[PDB]
Design a binder for this molecule. Structure first.
Ligand SMILES: [Ca+2]
Ligand SMILES: [Ca+2]
Ligand SMILES: [Ca+2]
Ligand SMILES: [Ca+2]
Ligand SMILES: [Ca+2]
Ligand SMILES: [Ca+2]
Ligand SMILES: [Cl-]
Ligand SMILES: [Cl-]
Ligand SMILES: [Mg+2]
Ligand SMILES: [Mg+2]
Ligand SMILES: [Mg+2]
Ligand SMILES: [Mg+2]
Lengths: 230, 8, 229, 5
């Protein structure tokens, strides 16, 4: 409860209607209730969970950046810092909710590569969003948790997936962004995007038309970042 | 800020 | 109420920050808190309150319409249940706005233009309720919407010239109410037509900017007359 | 039918 009495299938169905109505807080709440039924998520359901929370935290991050900028310009009453702190605490709350679902329900030592990598990338992403608003020593611990999650995901992906696999590609892209934007390691970020891009390009010849489009769309994002960064 | 993956 | 411990000026300040951050639910909660301090609102503050809730209710109406559509095409209980959930939330926001207009923005409004502004909001928000209401409840709501708009029309006819944008916008929404809600196409048409004509009579007297403002909303009346006749 | 934007 509030989703405890609803059938798993009905929560999934409603998550999909909430998506069509762009009601992403409802979608997240329905997917959280689904995960709490304790059965593993299918590939389509993992994507629903992630789209829902990506949109919820996407909004909070965008608002936080607005309010942060206004606060730095003003750095007078406490209202700007108060309201930035309120948004921040809410954003942290949603991060902690996702990390909680990942830790308590979803991350398994067992696992197919496609699920284990997907969730560990997620864990890295949500710690990264916590790192964006963190300061000082709390920050270094948070940064290390993100790094550790992305690293385990990378190790699995490189053992268990081909270098064009879109989940593997999206992971390298986000870990490269972690290096560049959070970890103060632009050379590592550049090297990771480069090697990822070039190892995927080398392998495109093995793909169908539709797999080629999936993989290349993400490669193009790698290239856009490399182009931005160099 | 560098963009991250826009999909899940 | 709940924002009771925060200063009125700080609520206003944070409503403007929330607007900047596109956090419209926060914006409306802050403006609710400001209204519940019990002081009148300035023209600018009224417009913050109106913007905030129009954004919130707007997103809920668009969601409800999406779900209603899916429900109607499916001719499982899940779509209806989730439509009813969004419906209930939308009803709550409308009841909240109406609660602020009647306790006590309308009776405290110190001038004609603000009294018209709140009475029009009262009609508009009963109108949003009517859109998702059924049965006897829908009939009561329709009558409450009609009454609030009519009171606004009375004041605006006594106190505002016929090209005034507030009076024009009021007439536009009331005529839409007649056509879309009250199933009264004849009242919709005759209100939109008389408002159009009475405004046209005075266009020659306007500044360039006022002529633009008035002819803009006259064109909105006109687009509706074209759809209805 | 569209109301006031
Ligand atoms: Ca069951
Ligand atoms: Ca605050
Ligand atoms: Ca398993
Ligand atoms: Ca494999
Ligand atoms: Ca496909
Ligand atoms: Ca529901
Ligand atoms: Cl999918
Ligand atoms: Cl710290
Ligand atoms: Mg803080
Ligand atoms: Mg360049
Ligand atoms: Mg103050
Ligand atoms: Mg006259």
């Amino acid at each position: 409860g509030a989703m405890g009495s609803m059938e798993r299938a009905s929560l999934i169905q409603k998550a999909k209607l909430a998506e069509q109505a762009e009601r992403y807080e409802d979608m997240a709440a329905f997917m959280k209730g689904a995960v709490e039924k304790g059965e593993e998520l299918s590939c389509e359901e993992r994507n629903l969970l992630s789209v829902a929370y990506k949109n919820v935290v996407g909004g909070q991050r965008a608002a936080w950046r607005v309010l942060s900028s206004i606060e730095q310009k003003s750095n007078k009453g406490p209202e700007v810092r108060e309201y930035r702190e309120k948004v921040e605490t809410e954003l942290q709350g949603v991060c902690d909710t996702v990390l909680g679902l990942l830790d308590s329900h979803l991350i398994k030592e067992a696992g197919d590569a496609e699920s284990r990598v997907f969730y560990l990338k997620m864990k890295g992403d949500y710690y990264r969003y916590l790192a964006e608003v963190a300061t000082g020593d709390d920050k270094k611990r948070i940064i290390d948790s993100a790094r550790s999650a992305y690293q385990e995901a990378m190790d699995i992906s490189k053992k268990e997936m081909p270098p064009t696999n879109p989940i593997r590609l999206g992971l390298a892209l986000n870990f490269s962004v972690f290096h560049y934007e959070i970890a103060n390691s632009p050379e590592e970020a550049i090297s990771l995007a480069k090697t990822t891009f070039d190892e995927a390009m080398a392998d495109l010849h093995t793909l169908s038309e539709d797999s080629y489009k999936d993989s290349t769309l993400i490669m193009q994002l790698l290239r856009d970042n490399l182009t931005l960064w160099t | 800020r560098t963009p991250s993956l826009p999909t899940p």
